[PDB]
Amino acid sequence: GNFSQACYNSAIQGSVLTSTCIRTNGGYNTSSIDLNSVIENVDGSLKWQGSNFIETCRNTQLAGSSELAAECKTRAQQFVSTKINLDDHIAAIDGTLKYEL
Amino acid sequence: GNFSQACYNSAIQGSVLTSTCIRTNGGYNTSSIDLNSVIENVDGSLKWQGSNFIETCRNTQLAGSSELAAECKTRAQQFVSTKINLDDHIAAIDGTLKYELEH
Numbered sequence: 700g701n702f703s704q705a706c707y708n709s710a711i712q713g714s715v716l717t718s719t720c721i722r723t724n725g726g727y728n729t730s731s732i733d734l735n736s737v738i739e740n741v742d743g744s745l746k747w748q749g750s751n752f753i754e755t756c757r758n759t760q761l762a763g764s765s766e767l768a769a770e771c772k773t774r775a776q777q778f779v780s781t782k783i784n785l786d787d788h789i790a791a792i793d794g795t796l797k798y799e800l
Numbered sequence: 801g802n803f804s805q806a807c808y809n810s811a812i813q814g815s816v817l818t819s820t821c822i823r824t825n826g827g828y829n830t831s832s833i834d835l836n837s838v839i840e841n842v843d844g845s846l847k848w849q850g851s852n853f854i855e856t857c858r859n860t861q862l863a864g865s866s867e868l869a870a871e872c873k874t875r876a877q878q879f880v881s882t883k884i885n886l887d888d889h890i891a892a893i894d895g896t897l898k899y900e901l902e903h
């Protein structure tokens with residue numbers, strides 16, 4: 700993971716991470732990834748190894764360089780604040796954001 | 801954005817846009833993008849900078865080349881007609897649909 704060391708000017712909008720990331724040729728690329736493919740809302744907490752968190756979460760934000768923050772619904776349908784470190788699994792590969800396991 | 805300038809046979813089904821786009825060096829690729837990731841319903845109006853419009857909108861359609869049209873609930877729970885131009889932020893990047901920023 701660790702895209703945040705390869706990238707800058709990062710932003711969160713909805714479930715899409717955008718970032719500007721370094722390229723081996725000296726340039727850079729503006730990249731984007733839909734995090735909803737790889738993050739699940741499990742009982743109010745953001746977790747890896749699933750999907751579709753955006754259906755049951757609101758108010759997504761980037762905190763610092765790599766933390767996704769949101770408010771998500773528990774199974775009993777109430778809201779809690781939650782966060783996940785995107786650096787865990789989001790990398791930059793020659794300027795392009797990618798999920799890595 | 802401006803995908804519609806490089807793309808063909810676009811379609812919307814639920815929250816998903818699918819299109820067939822000219823690749824940078826020739827030929828075509830087909831890709832999809834889930835618009836639910838980047839479009840919110842604010843009081844009956846489709847807007848960028850949020851997500852999950854599909855929870856409170858229905859009957860989504862493609863109008864012309866690039867407009868998402870749906871019926872979305874206002875806060876008062878009245879369905880109203882709304883549209884958003886997907887060319888605002890959806891690009892064709894070497895034949896693949898991608899959300900892009902404002903720079």
Ligand SMILES: OC[C@H]1O[C@H](O[C@H]2[C@@H](O)[C@H](O)[C@@H](CO)O[C@@H]2O)[C@@H](O)[C@@H](O)[C@@H]1O
Pocket residue numbers: 738739740741742743749750751752753754755756772773774775776
């Ligand atoms: O309903 C879509 C939802 O399904 C799964 O989430 C389950 C649970 O973890 C949630 O707390 C509640 C919130 O209402 O919904 C579920 O029952 C996950 O796939 C989740 O990502 C998704 O949004």
Ligand SMILES: OC[C@H]1O[C@H](O[C@H]2[C@@H](O)[C@H](O)[C@@H](CO)O[C@H]2O)[C@@H](O)[C@@H](O)[C@@H]1O
Pocket residue numbers: 757839840841842843844850851852853854855856857873874875877
């Ligand atoms: O309930 C999910 C819904 O939340 C937001 O919408 C707000 C409001 O703008 C909308 O008119 C009504 C419709 O009932 O729901 C409100 O509380 C927004 O994030 C939207 O995208 C989402 O569907």
